[PDB]
Write a protein that binds this ligand. Structure first.
Ligand SMILES: Nc1ncnc2c1nc(Cl)n2[C@@H]1O[C@H](CO)[C@@H](O)[C@H]1O
Length: 385
């Protein structure tokens, strides 16, 4: 029953996703708000602890006590220059407990501090409860994914987050490996198969090259930008609309925190529409000083606004190829991961770089990692019996 069942969890930097393999198919499980992905956010309020959508929804009202980006801290020392650099950009406090970072917040009127693995365990607990509500019984066996560049300390702290969350961690697997499993790229028989995984998420960009030799995976190269993602494209749209509001009304809105956040969420929404329509409309009632902001933008203008950022995704692709010592024509498969890979200009740039090649994109790119983890979790629990 529950003991013969296992879930696959993509514990992402900005969003998490949970899947289950049963009756010959993967089911990506929708949360209680009907969303197939859940924000990796934890909010501490005057009455409760919120996780996911409810935590992301109140981030503007409670920024000091709304934790996100715990994956950037997990398994790291406080003194790590990555930690010291990131801390300058977070609205929540990060403290030092014997060279280990802890996030410090106010919860039910009291000061509390949490290890990154404790924060990530609250996200994992939510993914576990989402699966349990769908299945109708508690599932505890799980495969959890991590970036291919995570070291032993980061992998161990992720497994620790799983244990705190009440999960039996069958295995910690690499995200690009889970994505290749989702597409069944390890079941092509004999001979070395070179796979490139292009992973453009909400806040990070990762390029991974893998060789699959008779089911055995080997990481040949990892490249990317830890601070490039979908949110940079939302911000380019924001700056455009701030300049357009200034041209129409001769008013600078950039200082009004509420006006900027409402414009930001509307921009994120319009950006998504631009992946399937050639124009998107913004409809913001009383954006600033009672002035409605009803406008539109073409996909052509959006592509111009992010042109330099889209083009920059090809330097880590080339860098990964040189590190792996492979030419473009030596790559057998191209896999898309992360919601931002739905952007047509991004697909066109990657396809043209690989000389007109087909892309593996039929699985929802923000779900492919949880899909493969769910497949692996089923194989692993079946072998355990
Ligand atoms: N249809 C889409 N077109 C463009 N960007 C998208 C789309 N869907 C998502 Cl999710 N994202 C973005 O992916 C990230 C999460 O993986 C977020 O930045 C989200 O906006």
């Amino acid at each position: 029953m529950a003991k013969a069942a296992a879930i696959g969890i993509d514990l992402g930097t900005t969003y998490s996703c949970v899947g289950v393999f049963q009756h010959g198919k993967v089911e990506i499980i929708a949360n209680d708000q009907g969303n197939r992905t859940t924000p990796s956010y934890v909010a501490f309020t005057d009455t409760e602890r919120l996780i996911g959508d409810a935590a992301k929804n109140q981030v503007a009202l409670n920024p000091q006590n709304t934790v996100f980006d715990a994956k950037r801290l997990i398994g790291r020392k406080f003194g790590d220059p990555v930690v010291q650099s990131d801390m300058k950009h977070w609205p929540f406090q990060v403290i030092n407990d014997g060279d280990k970072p802890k996030v410090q917040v106010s919860y039910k009127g009291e000061t509390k501090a949490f290890y990154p693995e404790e924060i990530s365990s609250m996200v994992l607990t939510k993914m576990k409860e989402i699966a349990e509500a769908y299945l109708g019984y508690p599932v505890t066996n799980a495969v959890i994914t991590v970036p291919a560049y995570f070291n032993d300390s980061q992998r161990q702290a992720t497994k620790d987050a799983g244990v705190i969350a009440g999960l039996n961690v069958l295995r910690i697997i690499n995200e690009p490996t889970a994505a290749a499993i989702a597409y069944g790229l390890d079941r092509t028989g004999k001979g070395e198969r070179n796979v490139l995984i292009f992973d453009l998420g909400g806040g990070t960009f990762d390029v991974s090259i893998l060789t699959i030799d008779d089911g055995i995976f080997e990481v040949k190269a990892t490249a990317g930008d830890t601070h490039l993602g979908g949110e940079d494209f939302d911000n380019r749209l924001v700056n455009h609309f701030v300049e357009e509001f200034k041209r129409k009304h001769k008013k600078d809105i950039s200082q009004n925190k509420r006006a900027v956040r409402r414009l930001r969420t509307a921009c994120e929404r319009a950006k998504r529409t631009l992946s399937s329509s050639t124009q998107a409309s913004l409809e913001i009632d009383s954006l600033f000083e009672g002035i409605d902001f009803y406008t539109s933008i073409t996909r052509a203008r959006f592509e111009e606004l992010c042109s330099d950022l889209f083009r920059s995704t090809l330097e880590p692709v080339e860098k990964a190829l040189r590190d792996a010592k492979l030419d473009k024509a030596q790559i057998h498969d191209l896999v898309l991961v992360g919601g931002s890979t739905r952007i047509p200009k991004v697909q066109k740039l990657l396809q043209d770089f690989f000389n007109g090649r087909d892309l593996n994109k039929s699985i929802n790119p923000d779900e492919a990692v949880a899909y493969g983890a769910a497949v692996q979790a089923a194989i692993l629990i079946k072998s355990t019996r």
